[PDB]
Amino acid sequence: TPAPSILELEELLRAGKSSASRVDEVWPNLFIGDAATANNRFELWKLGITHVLNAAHKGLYAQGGPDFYGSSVSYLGVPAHDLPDFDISAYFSSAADFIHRALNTPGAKVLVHSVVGVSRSATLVLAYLMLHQRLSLRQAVITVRQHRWVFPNRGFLHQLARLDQQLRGA
C-alpha cells in the first residue's frame, strides 16, 4: 500500500472532529494544544502535564529542565516555522524520543503545542505515532483526527509521507 498523496491526506484530515477545543488528549497521556494552553501554568498543573514539547519555540532548539515555578519537569523547544519549505523532519527522531521517554515514565503526561495546535505540533505527534506505535501515516491521522482537528501544511505532509515510505518500505 503506498503512502497517501497530499490530496488523500487532506481528505483524511477533513473528515474527523468538527470541534474547536484549545487542547485535546489524542493518545493516552499525550495532548496537543495551542499557545494559550501552554502559557497557563495553573491549568497545565490541573491537567497533570509534566513534559512540554513546544513545536513553535522561539530561539535556538533547546531542552529545558524543571520550570522555575510551574509543574513542568522537562521541556523541549523545537524552533519550527509553519512553512512548507521548513524541514521539520530533522526533528522527528529527537521529538519522538522525548515523547517516548516521557510516556514510558509512570505518571507522566506530555503536551505538544504550537501557536494554534494544528500543524507543527500535530506533525510531531504523527511522526511519534509512526516511529514508536507501529502506525502507518493513515492510521496516525485517523487516530489523531477523532480527538482534534489538525492540518499540517503540505510541506509537512510530504515529509510525513516520506517517513511513511521509509518506515513501511512504501
UniProtKB/Swiss-Prot annotation:
Keywords: Cytoplasm, Hydrolase, Protein phosphatase. Residues 22-169 form the Tyrosine-protein phosphatase domain. Disulfide bonds: none annotated. Pfam families: DSPc. It is an enzyme of class 3 (hydrolase). Its main location: cytoplasm. Gene3D superfamilies: Protein tyrosine phosphatase superfamily. Monomer. Interacts with MAP3K5/ASK1; may compete with AKT1 preventing MAP3K5/ASK1 phosphorylation by AKT1. Belongs to the protein-tyrosine phosphatase family. Non-receptor class dual specificity subfamily. This is Dual specificity protein phosphatase 13A. It comes from Homo sapiens.
